[PDB]
């Protein structure tokens, strides 16, 4: 992934989002309702100090659970770090702040998952074209997209 | 689906194939290794009388099973019928016989699953472009593609 957002203003990504579409390098990362990177964005919350908190939904042990994760800032405005047992990165690819945002999460070995976020529960063909433009430069093997009904449900049921 | 293969010669599709890629209208039809339309082609066998037999693999009750289904001919050369509890159709979209073949299976209510077949275990970008050309005219919400290692395994493990 060598497409980041030039001139990103992190504070302007704040608020409500919908995961309209998702893609990953490996089928198993997104294949089931409880696959490990089948995570749905609810809200992005930039911090005063410049870190990026994600509020997420995920299907975990037979139900739709909530969870807050903090991605810490780097010297590069469009790149954040979630460092657990591995060093993983969050990259903001492109946004216009008021309609869409593209991001990826990636490991450091090679393995990758990206999403098209939108501000409202509708299919934005334009935002989806920019997503597919970004993805043709990456080795994705599975792609999912959601309908407006699903987008208004918990865990996109 | 309003893309069929003009001038199809059914007998020439005979022999070995690989399911390089699959797409469907509904996420649940392809989402798990045991999803109901996650079926892998092994061989197409046209009959003397002009019907089309598929030899398939599918993951069923924790293992990789074999199964033979017969799709019966119609007055339209590129359209065959699998009629169980519902009337379902097999449509041949496009082929050159010696490298690729695109087909869909569809119900009569609206619900749809299509595949890109290739003759050899390799990623054929050209064949994949024709597949994605066909799919942009259809309401697909999930897409899978397989690597050469996976294509040489039973049930694409």
UniProtKB/Swiss-Prot annotation, chains A, B:
The record's subcellular location field reads: Secreted
> Which terms are listed as keywords in the entry?
Allergen, Disulfide bond, Milk protein, Retinol-binding, Secreted, Signal, Transport
Q: Which GO terms describe its cellular component?
A: extracellular region
**Which InterPro entries has this protein been placed in?**
Blactoglobulin, Calycin, Lipocalin, Lipocalin_CS, Lipocln_cytosolic_FA-bd_dom
Q: In which tissues is it expressed?
A: Synthesized in mammary gland and secreted in milk.
The record describes its post-translational modification as: Alternate disulfide bonds occur in equal amounts in all variants examined.
Q: Disulfide bonds, which pairs?
A: 64-155, 104-114, 104-116
User: Which CDD domains does this chain map to?
Assistant: lipocalin_beta-LG-like (cd19416)
- One GO molecular-function annotation for this sequence? retinol binding
Among PANTHER family, the record links this protein to: GLYCODELIN, LIPOCALIN
Q: Assembly and partners?
A: Under physiological conditions beta-lactoglobulin exists as an equilibrium mixture of monomeric and dimeric forms. Interaction with LMBR1L which mediates the endocytosis of LGB has been observed in PubMed:17991420, but not in PubMed:23964685.
Functional summary from the UniProt entry: Primary component of whey, it binds retinol and is probably involved in the transport of that molecule.
Q: Which family does it belong to?
A: Belongs to the calycin superfamily. Lipocalin family.
Tell me the protein's name. Beta-lactoglobulin
The organism encoding this protein is: Bos taurus
Q: Which gene encodes it?
A: LGB
